[PDB]
Paper text:
PqsE has two biochemical activities, a protein–protein interaction with RhlR, which increases RhlR transcriptional activity at target promoters, and an esterase activity. Curiously, RhlR function additionally depends on the metallo-β-hydrolase enzyme PqsE, encoded as the final gene in the pqsABCDE biosynthetic operon. With respect to RhlR, PqsE is required to form a protein–protein interaction that enhances the affinity of RhlR for target promoters. The effects of the PqsE E182W and PqsE NI substitutions on pyocyanin production are not through impairment of PqsE catalytic function, as the catalytically inactive variant, PqsE(D73A), remains fully capable of interacting with RhlR and driving pyocyanin production. These results indicate that PqsE has two independent functions, catalysis and interaction with RhlR, and it is interaction with RhlR, not catalysis, that is required for virulence. Moreover, the RhlR–PqsE interaction is essential for P. aeruginosa virulence phenotypes, and therefore, of interest as a focus for antibiotic development.
We recently showed that the ability of PqsE to interact with RhlR can be weakened by the introduction of an “inhibitor mimetic” mutation in which the glutamate residue at position 182 is altered to tryptophan [PqsE(E182W)].24 The PqsE(E182W) variant is a stable protein that, while harboring all of the catalytic residues, nonetheless displays less than 10% of wildtype catalytic activity, as if an inhibitor is bound in the active site. To understand, at an atomic level, what conformational changes the E182W alteration induced in PqsE to affect its ability to interact with RhlR, we determined the structure of PqsE(E182W). Although the PqsE(E182W) crystals grow in the same P3221 crystal form as WT PqsE, there is a significant structural rearrangement in the active site. In WT PqsE, the sidechain of E182 lies at the edge of the ligand binding site and makes hydrogen bonds with R191 and Q272. These interactions do not occur in PqsE(E182W), and rather, new interactions are made between the sidechain of the introduced W182 residue and F276, L277, and P278. Examination of electron density within the active site indicated a surprising consequence—with the sidechain of E280 relocating by 12 Å and becoming Fe bound in the center of the active site. Indeed, the repositioned E280 sidechain directly binds both Fe atoms, acting as a bridging ligand, and thus is most likely responsible for the stabilizing effect the E182W alteration has on PqsE, which we have reported previously. The crystal structure of PqsE(E182W) revealed that a loop rearrangement inserts the E280 residue into the active site to coordinate both of the iron atoms at this site.
Numbering used by the authors: 0 to 272, 275 to 297
Amino acid sequence: HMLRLSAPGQLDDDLCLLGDVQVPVFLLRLGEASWALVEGGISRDAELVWADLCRWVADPSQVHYWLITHKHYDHCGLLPYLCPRLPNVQVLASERTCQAWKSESAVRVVERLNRQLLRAEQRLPEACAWDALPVRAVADGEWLELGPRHRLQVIEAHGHSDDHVVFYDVRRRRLFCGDALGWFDEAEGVWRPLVFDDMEAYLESLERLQRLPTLLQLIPGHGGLLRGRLAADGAESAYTECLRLCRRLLWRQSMGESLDELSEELHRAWGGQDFLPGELHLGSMRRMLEILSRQA
Ligand SMILES: [Fe+3]
Ligand SMILES: [Fe+3]
């Protein structure tokens, strides 16, 4: 579709999509000899993303930054496998995201979920320890001076997860929004909410993101780049779709429907029977509905 760029390769003068559009890694060209990556993908894509990267970057020591929106397994799975191959990279993540990588139990969930995505054929590259990643914690509101033409602000955007941040390039009216708006369903053309931590924070984050200067490019954690009206109206539409889901929940609960019943229905109606993102399955759908039920 015209308003959505969802193919691997070049997306803008400074911007490329690496790997699988469902779990993409974005490549920013910061200068003649300087690059950044945005989003951290899934572990099993290490060699695919590496192969794509080397088509654009002849010298991987020129990759200087890796920006991470949140701790979910599908947004940091590549780090232990590709960081050893990027000797100059600095991983930029929020305080709470960095904390997840020094938690034994959290690292265990991330690795189990990523291992489930391995094909029987493949073996992962040699990994460095999660607590040995070259990370620099970034704070809410901090300006990331990545290069002479790349200045991105860190914006706290909790609610999808308790650590989630977004990255705003105001020069380009470009927002890397992770999962904070949900999952864009390219079938129906609408956002599907992904409220896995706190509904009030998720909605509050979307209110603040609507107050940004009008977006030209909106780049979520899954599905590629959105432009035109999809970017300009994205945060508002995601807010609307979350309220719409709340109302549907309260409607059907008050007709005696159990959450498991509605979890099944919604999972079906959104296409769950590799269409939905890996993080939106019956169990996590059930978790989101639980969260919305409690906060309403
Ligand atoms: Fe997520
Ligand atoms: Fe995700």
